[PDB]
Each structure stands twice: as structure tokens, then as C-alpha cells.
């Protein structure tokens, strides 16, 4: 009998199936447990599936993840499959959390729509724009303060989204009806009279 | 049969596999075919069986093939016992088919028009950038007709 999903066996003739490692899933059987592919997390031992965590959160580590947690305060996650690379800027990735720079801010890891600060109103009439000071800042600050022209950082453009999966192929044609059998043997000829 | 090149990216690179046929005792002339994703060998080659069953891999011709598309290959090697040349089908003995997945190459297309809003009765030029996945194979030119 094959080992039920959530366990594995790596030796011929073992009565018991060992439980899969934490942060790893298994299908029906499997010689070894396959770790969660890319930006997902299992978050439990012997789990049958690695759950692809929702947008606004990032996986602890790439591939082998323990628990997806919310992006930091000055951050946002536009895609579900957001995963920290664990090398380079701690908790940023190509599909991971971004800082929503200067114009935008979130300040409460809730949504991917980083808000473009609140434009404060001095008294009743005067209006002033608010810009952050360090890429993604928690609390906005009014403009005309702290050397605006310093802002020189790279501005990337998102790649196009992956296309839709192809439709399932047509099923195998059913077997044809059995052919008719050979006709029955004729009745024996009469004997010679006498 | 085992794949030597490994990491098969469909049409990229070359897919090489080297087989080895063992027979226990009474070793004689065998006919060995190779079957790719579609089509089998017409001459059906010719195997000479020299080693004993102890020595598993015998000297089989190392045939390589360049498949197409991302579909699974399921490379079959059928060995026909009797002849084959004289319009007589041989007997399947081993077969031992192995299948290996591959990774197809996707193409990207980006469009841009000029003028950027089409005025009535005004000519427009649509420029398209075509991007290839990974890199072009070495010494391989491709002519696209769009």
C-alpha cells in the first residue's frame, strides 16, 4: 500500500512511513518529501500541501519556509507568491515586499495599495503635500522639508503576468462495440436412405 | 538507458542517452530499435551481444536526438528478436521505457504604435519587440516570419 500523503519512506520493505519534515508536503507515496516550491509555506509537519500565502505577507525563507508573516511597516506585497530571498536586503524579493517609495506608504501591513500620504491642510485654506524621507516611511512628513532633490534611486517596471493555463486535452476515445461472431454451424445433412 | 547530457531544455542543447543491453547466457545477434516521441527506426539497426549477463551495459550505439516542444518524451527502446528486414515482426523482450520532463522556451512580444492615438485617415506604424527565453543556442540562426 502506498504511504498516505503527509509521510514518506526511503527504504525497501518498511512497514511504517516516516512523517515528512516541517515545511514540506507529500503526495500519495513518494520516496522523499519534496520541499515547498518557491514562494509558499507548509507551516506544519507532515502536511499534504504547502499553502501559497496571501498577498501582503512573505515567506520566512525561500523554498523551505516556516510561516509566512506580514511585510514590514513601510512595505507592501502586491502578489500572493511573495517570498524573502534570505540574502540581500533581508525581506525583499522580485515578487516579494516592496517599499512603495516616497509618494506611497502603508504603515500597517494590511494591503498592497500603499497610500500616497495625506495632503495636510494648514488651518482651512492652505494645503501642503506630504512626502516621506526614506523610501518607505511610516509617518508622512509635509513637503518643502529636508532636501527633496536627493531622491535618486532605481525605478523598475513589473513583468507581465503569467498567461492562463491551457485547457485539458480531450479524453481517450471509448473502445468500440464488439464485432458480431461467426454464424452458427448448419444442421447435419440427412443420412442416405437405405 | 541513461541520459548523459541531463537538464533537458527541449530544443535547447542536445539530448544524449546511452543504453546497455545484458543477456544472461546464450548471447547472439539481436535487433534493437529506438523510439522517440513519435516514429521508430526503419532499418531497426543491428545489435551484437558479446558480454555476459554479469556485465550489464553492452556496447550499444549512442544515439542522440533533438526533440521539440515541452511535452514528455517517453523514449522507448524496443528490441525485436527475429530479423525485421524480411517483413517479419520481432519479439519485444525488454522495452524498459524511460520518460523525462523538459522545459519549453516561451516567447515575449511587446507592441508600440506611432502615432500613439490613431487619427482617422492617418498611417500608423506598429513596432514589436520579440524576446527569446534564456539564450539562443550557439551557432543556431532562426528566421521568424510574422
Amino acid at each position: 500500500k502506498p504511504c498516505q500523503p503527509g509521510r514518506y519512506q526511503n527504504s525497501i520493505g518498511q512497514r511504517v512511513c516516516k512523517p515528512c519534515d516541517m515545511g514540506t508536503y507529500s503526495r500519495y507515496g513518494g520516496e522523499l518529501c519534496t520541499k515547498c516550491p518557491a514562494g509558499t509555506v507548509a507551516s506544519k509537519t507532515g502536511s499534504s500541501q504547502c499553502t501559497p500565502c496571501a498577498a501582503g505577507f512573505y515567506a520566512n525563507a525561500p523554498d523551505s519556509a516556516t510561516s509566512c508573516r506580514a511585510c514590514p511597516r513601510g512595505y507592501y506585497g502586491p502578489y500572493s507568491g511573495a517570498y524573502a530571498d534570505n540574502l540581500g536586503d533581508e525581506f525583499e524579493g522580485p515578487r516579494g515586499c516592496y517599499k512603495c517609495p516616497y509618494d506611497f506608504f502603508a504603515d500597517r501591513p494590511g494591503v498592497r495599495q500603499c497610500t500616497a500620504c495625506p495632503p495636510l491642510d494648514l488651518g482651512g485654506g492652505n494645503l501642503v503635500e506630504q512626502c516621506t524621507e526614506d523610501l518607505g516611511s511610516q509617518r508622512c512628513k509635509p513637503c518643502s522639508l529636508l532636501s527633496k532633490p536627493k531622491t535618486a534611486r532605481t525605478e523598475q517596471s513589473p513583468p507581465p503576468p503569467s498567461p492562463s493555463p491551457p485547457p485539458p486535452p480531450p479524453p481517450s476515445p471509448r473502445p468500440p462495440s464488439p464485432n458480431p461472431p461467426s454464424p452458427r454451424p448448419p444442421s447435419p445433412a440427412p443420412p442416405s436412405p437405405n | 538507458l541513461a541520459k548523459t547530457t541531463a537538464d533537458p531544455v527541449t530544443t535547447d542543447d542536445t539530448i544524449a542517452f546511452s543504453a546497455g543491453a545484458k543477456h544472461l547466457s546464450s548471447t547472439s545477434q539481436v535487433w534493437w530499435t529506438i523510439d522517440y516521441g513519435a516514429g521508430e527506426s526503419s532499418p531497426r539497426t543491428a545489435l551484437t551481444m558479446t558480454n555476459v549477463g554479469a556485465a550489464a551495459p553492452n556496447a550499444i550505439a549512442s544515439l542522440s536526438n533533438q526533440y521539440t516542444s515541452g511535452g514528455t518524451k517517453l523514449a522507448t527502446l524496443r528490441i525485436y528478436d527475429r530479423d525485421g528486414v524480411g517483413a517479419n515482426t520481432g519479439l519485444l523482450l525488454a522495452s524498459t521505457t524511460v520518460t523525462f520532463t523538459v522545459t519549453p522556451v516561451l516567447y515575449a512580444l511587446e507592441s508600440a504604435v506611432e502615432p500613439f492615438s490613431p487619427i482617422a485617415t492617418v498611417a500608423a506604424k506598429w513596432s514589436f519587440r520579440i524576446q527569446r527565453s534564456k539564450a539562443t543556442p550557439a551557432g543556431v540562426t532562426e528566421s521568424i516570419k510574422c
Partner: protein, 48 residues
């Protein structure tokens, strides 16, 4: 953490895991939910 065995045939009572806030007990007494109905019902103790 606690391990969960793959599908084992168990007659009636023995239950691998209960759901949403119930502490598994290895007893013979008849339990529904977590409040009990009868006692010394099952011949051999089973997981309530």
C-alpha cells in the same frame, strides 16, 4: 510535535484525532462530543 498515523482500521471508538477543542482520552466510557452519555460501554477502551 505530535505525530498522526496514516489510515489505520479501527473498529468503532478508536479515533486518531478529535476536532476543534476536545482532549482525546483513552477510556471505555461512552462519550458524545465532550459530555459523556454512558460509562463502561465499550469492552476495550477507545479514543473518546
Amino acid at each position: 510535535p505530535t505525530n498522526v498515523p496514516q489510515r489505520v482500521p479501527l473498529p468503532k471508538g478508536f479515533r486518531t484525532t478529535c476536532f476543534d477543542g476536545y482532549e482525546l482520552i483513552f477510556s471505555n466510557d461512552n462519550y458524545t462530543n465532550g459530555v459523556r452519555v454512558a460509562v463502561d460501554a465499550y469492552p476495550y477502551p477507545v479514543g473518546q
